[PDB]
Symmetry: C5
C-alpha cells in the first residue's frame, strides 16, 4: 500500500518577477508531514518524545534503517535554491515533520504578453514525487499553503491563490504525484501611464498646438522628429519584454503612432507643395482639414487597436 | 518549562540599500547564549572548562545526546547568507555561546516612496524561533545588539535603532518567539539637488532669459525641446524606483513641469498667431503677461505640490 | 569485458540562449541505468528489494566495495552546475538507477552568424565517459532523452532533436564513450521586423516624402541626420552579437544604408551646386532623376544583399 | 598565560576597487604560525616529522584533543570568501603552520571623495581574534605581509603599505587582538584628462571661436546646448560615485560651468536686445567685452575652485 | 624529491574581459605522481586500480601520514567551479589525478598601447606549496595546451607554450611552478565596422557639404561632428580599464578633436571675411579651405602611424 505524504508550500516573499526571462523569484517554506511506522521509537521515562534532526543525519538514519524517503523535485525550479532551514522533527509514532525554508527562481512558462500592459498572468510552483503513486501519494497539508501578507511586490497585484494535486510521468511509466501552488497576478498601470502614455500623448498634443502657427515646413520637421522619438520609445518598450514571436497591444500602439506620423509628414508635404506652386489660398482653405485630420487620425487609431484587442 | 535563549544582533556594515528591489544588505554578527543543563560536562583537574566546537560537530553532539536546539530563521532574509564564522563555546555548566558572522540581503517591505526624495524608511531584521514559546523563549541579550560605527553607507543616514521581542505563528498553532532589530534612515538630498533640482531649475531659468529676445517661434522651439528634456529626466527618476502603483512627490514634480511646458507652447502659439494676423503691437503689449506668466506658473506649481504633499 | 552504461538526457527548460557569449542554459534531468553484479545484495523476507541512496553515501559504498563507477563529464559545460537531485536506487540485482536534476550553462561553439537574423543554429550537450570503452560503454537509454514541451524559450524555436553515441580521446590513449543530445533552432523574426526593419524602412520612406518639397539643402540635412541614425542602429545591432571576425547579413544591410545615404548627400550637393551657379531650371529638370534615384538605390541595394547572401 | 599567534597577510592581486559601493577586491594569502605544546607528537624512526592536514580533519583533531584554536574573523570582509587553499603543517614541536589562500571583497569605509579626481584613499584589511588577549595574542609574522608586484590594478597606484597590531572589543568585555594590513593609493588622472577635461575644454574653446562670427542669436543657441552637454557630463560623473551627502571638486567644477554658461546666455540676450532696439553700433562696441568676458569668466571660475579646494 | 607530472589543457575560452584584465577558461588539470608508500597488494580477481573521490583519497593520505603535492593556481580569481576531482591509484602507487574546472584568471600582461592592433599574453600559473627538496614539477607529455573548440570569436590564439620555473611565495627556498602560456591577437572587423567606417563616413560626407559654399553651415557641421567624436570617445573608453597611458585609439580620437577644432576656427575666419565685405577673397581662399580638410586628416593619419609604428 502507498503512504500519504502531506505537502504544504507557502510563498513569504516575491523577490521579483522578471518578465524578460519569464521567471519569478520567491522566499518560501515547504512543509511535509509523513508517517513512517518503521521510524517509530521507544523512549524511556524522562527522555524526549520528539527527536530533532538535521537533514542529513536524518537521511543517514533512513539509509541505515533501509527506508525510502518521498524524494521530490521542484519541477519548474531554475538555478540555485539557497536554503535557510532543512529541519526534521520525528515523533514517537514515526511522524516525520519536515521544514524547508528557501529562496529560489521558478520558470514562468504561462506568460502571455498579447494584452501587455493590461495583462493578467499565471504563476505556479510544481512539487513532484520522484517515486510513483503506488509507493507515495501526495496529499494537501491543510492550514499551511498559500502566499504571505508581506510579499514585497510593488508592480504586480495577486488576484487569487490555488492549490491542487495532479499526476506526472517524468521518470516513471506509471503516474506520480504532483503538488501545485498557483497564483494569478495583474499589473499596476501607473508606471506605463506616467512614463509611456502621458509622455507619448504630450508629444502628440503639444505638437498639434504648433499647427496653429500655419508653417507647413515646421510641421514636417516636427512630425519627422516625433517619428524618431516614437522609434526610441519602441526600443524602451522592447527592453521590458522577451524577443517575442507575436505582436503585443503596446507594439500595435507604437506601430500605430508610426503610421499616423508617417501620414502627417505626407500630408503637410502636399500642402507645402500647393504653396510652392502658387496655390497658398487653396492650401490655407484645406489647412482646416490638415489641422482637424491630426486629432481624428489618432482618435481613429485608438478605436482601431481597442477593437482589434477587445 | 521553557528555556531562555538570549538573542543579540549587530549590523557592522550596510553593504547597500537597493530601493528598486526594496531590500538592503548587511554584514552582521548574531550572538546566542543558551543554558542547556543536559550539555553540562565533568572535566578532570588541569583539563579545559570550556569546549570549543565548530557548528556542526556541535549539532552532531546534540543529535547524539538527543537534545533539541533553538532552531531559528531570519524571517525577512533573501538569497544566500554567506557565513564568515559559526563557532560554539560550551562551558562546564552547559552554557552554549554561539557566534554567527554573515553577509546577507534582507527584504525591506516597509518602503513608502510617496514623499521621495524627502522620505524616511524603516529597515528591520526578523529572527524567529521555529519551536514555540512552551519549548524556547527569546530574550534580549544585553550589551550587544545594534548598528556599528563604520556602516559604510553614504546616501542614507540612520536616525534611530530599536530592539524588541514579539510572537509569530509561521509553522506552529501556538505563539513562537521573534527577535526584532529595527532602524530608521533618512536620505542625504545632495545627489537629487546636484543632479536633478539644479539642472531642472537651470533649464527653466536660462530658457526664460531667451524670452527677452521677443521671438515667439524661438520660445515655442525652446519649450518643445524642454518638454523632451523633462521626459528624459522622467526616465532618469523612474530608473531609481520600482514600478510603483502610486505617485511620488518627484512624479508630481515632473508631471508639473510637463503641464507648465505644454502651456508655454500653447501661449506662445497664441502670441505668434496674433503677429501672423497683423496684430504685432497687441502681441507686444501682451508679451509682458507672457514673460511674467512663465515664472508665476512654475512658482504656482511649486506651491501646489508643497501643499498637496505637506 | 566492458559494462553497458545506459545514458538518458532530457532538457526540461531553456532558461535562455546568450548569443553574445555563445552559450545556452538548460534545466535538465540525466538518467543512468547500470548493472554492476558486485553491488547485488541479499535481503530477508519482508525487507526492501530496492535500496535508496544519496550520492555520496552510494559513492562511499563503491569505494568500500573497491568498485569503479562510470565517472562522466559534461564536456561542453560552463561554470557551476546547480543540482536539484542526485539520487540512486539500487536493486537486489545490482542495477543502479541514477537521476541527476540540474541547471547549467553549456558552450554553444556551433554559432554561425553569417545569415543573422535569418540563421539556424546547432545546440548540443556532450556527456563523456572518463574511463575508456574497454571498461565502460555508453548505450542509449530508450524512452527518455529529448526536449520537454514547456522549454520557456520565446525567440527561438526548436526545429529537430537528435541523440547519438561517438568516441572521444580526452584523457585516454584509447577511445572513450560520448553521449550526444543535439537540437537545431531557428529565430522568430518579429523582434527584428518590429524594431529594426520597420523603423529603418520608415526613416527611409518618410525621408523620401520630403523630396517633394524641392529644397536640396533640406534633403542634405535630412540624409546627414539619417546617416547618424543608421550609425546608432549599427551600435544597437553590434550589442546583440559577439565581436565577430566576419560580416553578417545585418552588417552588410547597415553598411548598405551608409553607402546609399552617403551618395544621397553627394547627389543633392550637386543639384544645389547647379542652383548656386544660376542653373535652377537644369537642377529642376534633373530633380526627377534625384527623386527617382533614392527608391532605386535602396531597391538596388536590397537586391545586391539578397543575391550576395542567397 | 596567553599564546602568541603569528599573523601574516599578503595581497597578491587587486581584482578591482569599486568606488560606487566603497569596497575593494583582493586575492590574498593568510599565514599563521602558532605553537601549541599539547599538539606535539612522538614519531618513530623513518616516520614523518611534519604532519600535513586538511583544515578540517585538523579542526576535528583539535576538538578530539579538546584544544581551542585562535578563531579569527576578517572584520571588514563582505560577501563570500572563495578559498583556494586551507592547509595545515604540524611539526613534532606542536607548531601549526596555516595557509589560507582566498579571493574576497572588503569594505572600504575610509573613502573621502571631497578632492575627487585628485584624491588619495586608505584601504585596509582587519583580522580580529574572536578570543581575548588573555588567551591569544596576535604577533606580526615577519618576512611575509604586504602587497605583491603583479596586483593588476591600472587606475590606482599604491603609495605605501603598513602593518600594525591593535585591540578590539567586538564580542568580549576585555581587549582582543586585531591585525591590520593598510595601504594608501592615489589615482591615475589620464582617464579624467582624456574623457572629461579635454572634451569640456574643447567644447568651451571651439564655442568661443564662433563669437568672432558676431551673431548674438547663434551664441545664445550655442551656450544653451553647451549647458545641456554639461548636464549630461554631470550625469556621467555622478555614475562613478556613490550618492554622497557632500560636494566633490568635480561637482563644484560642473556647477561652475553651469553658472558661467547661464551667464553667457544672459549676456548675449542683452546684446541682442540692444540690436533689436536699433542700437546695433552700441552692441558692436560692447561686443569686445562679451568676447573677452567668456575666457575671463572660465579663468575666474577655475581660480575660485582652486582656492576653495587648495 | 618526488617527481609530480603536471598537465593543463584549456578546453574553452568562456571570455576575455579586457576592462577587468582577466580571462575565463574551462580546463582539465592532470597529475601523475608515484608514491611507493601508497602501493597495495591485491588478491587474484580483485582490482589492480582503485578509484577514489578526492577526498576519501586525501583522508587515506592523512591516515597513512603521507604528504600530497599541495598546489595553487597562483593567478586564479574568485570561485573555481569543479566538474570532476577523481583519483585512480595503481598497484605501484601511481596516483592519476584529474581536475575539471571553470575559472577566471588574472591577465596582468595587458598592454593596450597599440589597441586595437594589440597582441596579448595570457597564462595560468600552477605552483607547488611545498619546496623543490620535497616535490619537483615535471611536464606531463601528451596533454597540455589549448583545445580546438575554444569558442572565442574576437581573439585568435597565435601560439601556446608550457614551461617550468621556480617561485618563493610561502617558502625561503625555491618551489616548483608550471606555466601554460598563450598569445592572442584581435579580429579587427568589429573596430572596422563600428568605429573606423562610421568615423570616416562622418568625415567624408561632412566634406561633401563644403561644395555648398556656406561657411556658417560648415561651422555648424564641424561643431556637431566634434560632439559625435566626444561620444565615440566614450564608446571606446567603455571597452578598456581607466588606464594611466594613451592608446593608439586615444591618439586617433584626440586627433579628430584637434582637426575638427581647426575646421571650426578656419571657417570662422572665411565667414569673418564675407562679413567684412570681402566675399570674393573668401571665395578664392575657399579652395584652400576645401583642400585643407582632406590634407589635415591625411596629415593626422601619417602622424599617428609614425608616432606608433
Ligand atoms: C518635440 C515635441 C515638442 C513639440 C513642440 C514644438 C516646438 C519644437 C520642439 O523641438 C522639436 O523637436 C523635434 C524632435 O527631436 C525636432 O525634430 C524638431 O525639429 C524640433 O523643432
Ligand atoms: C535647452 C536649454 C537651454 C536654453 C537656452 C537657449 C538657447 C538654445 C539651446 O538649445 C535648445 O535646446 C532645446 C532642447 O533640445 C531645443 O528644443 C531648442 O530648439 C534649442 O534651441
Ligand atoms: C529623421 C527622419 C524623419 C524625416 C522627416 C522629415 C522632417 C524632419 C525630421 O527631423 C530631422 O531629423 C534628422 C535626424 O536627426 C536631422 O538631421 C534633420 O536635420 C531633421 O530635419
Ligand atoms: C556644441 C559644441 C561645438 C560648437 C561649435 C559651433 C558649431 C555648432 C555646433 O552645433 C551646436 O550644438 C549645440 C549642442 O547641442 C546646439 O545647441 C547648437 O544649436 C548647435 O549649433
Ligand atoms: C553629421 C554627419 C552628416 C553630415 C552631412 C551633412 C548634412 C547635415 C547632417 O546633420 C548635421 O548633424 C550635425 C551633428 O549633430 C549637426 O551639428 C549639424 O548642424 C547638422 O546639420
Ligand atoms: Ba536640431
Ligand atoms: Zn569545573
Amino acid at each position: 500500500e502507498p503512504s500519504d505524504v502531506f505537502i504544504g508550500l507557502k510563498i513569504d516573499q516575491i523577490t521579483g518577477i522578471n518578465q524578460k526571462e519569464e521567471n519569478f523569484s520567491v522566499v518560501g517554506s515547504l512543509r511535509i508531514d509523513w508517517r513512517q511506522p518503521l521510524l517509530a521509537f521507544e523512549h524511556a521515562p524522562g527522555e524526549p518524545k520528539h527527536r530533532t534532526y538535521t537533514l542529513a543525519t536524518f537521511l543517514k538514519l533512513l539509509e541505515e534503517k533501509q527506508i525510502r524517503w518521498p524524494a521530490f523535485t521542484y519541477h519548474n525550479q531554475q538555478g540555485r535554491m539557497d536554503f535557510q532551514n532543512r529541519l526534521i522533527s520525528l515523533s514517537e509514532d514515526g511522524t516525520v515533520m519536515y521544514l524547508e525554508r528557501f529562496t529560489s527562481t521558478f520558470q514562468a512558462p504561462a506568460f502571455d504578453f498579447r494584452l501587455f500592459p493590461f495583462d493578467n498572468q499565471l504563476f505556479f510552483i510544481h512539487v513532484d514525487s520522484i517515486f510513483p503513486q503506488h509507493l507515495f501519494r501526495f496529499q494537501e497539508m491543510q492550514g499551511f499553503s498559500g502566499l504571505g501578507d508581506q510579499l514585497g511586490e510593488e508592480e504586480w497585484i495577486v488576484t487569487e491563490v490555488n492549490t491542487h494535486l495532479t499526476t506526472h510521468n517524468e521518470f516513471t511509466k506509471g503516474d506520480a504525484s504532483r503538488f501545485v501552488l498557483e497564483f494569478h497576478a495583474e499589473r499596476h498601470l501607473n508606471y506605463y501611464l506616467m512614463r509611456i502614455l502621458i509622455p507619448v500623448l504630450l508629444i502628440i498634443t503639444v505638437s498639434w498646438f504648433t499647427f496653429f502657427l500655419q508653417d507647413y515646413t515646421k510641421r514636417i520637421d516636427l512630425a519627422g522628429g516625433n517619428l524618431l522619438l516614437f522609434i526610441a520609445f519602441n526600443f524602451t518598450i522592447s527592453s521590458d519584454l522577451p524577443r517575442l514571436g507575436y505582436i503585443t497591444l503596446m507594439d500595435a500602439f507604437l506601430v500605430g503612432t508610426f503610421i499616423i506620423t508617417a501620414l502627417v509628414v505626407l500630408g503637410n508635404v502636399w500642402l507645402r507643395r500647393l504653396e510652392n506652386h502658387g496655390k497658398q489660398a487653396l492650401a490655407r482653405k484645406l489647412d482646416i482639414y490638415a489641422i482637424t485630420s491630426y486629432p481624428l487620425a489618432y482618435l481613429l487609431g485608438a478605436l482601431t487597436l481597442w477593437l482589434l484587442f477587445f
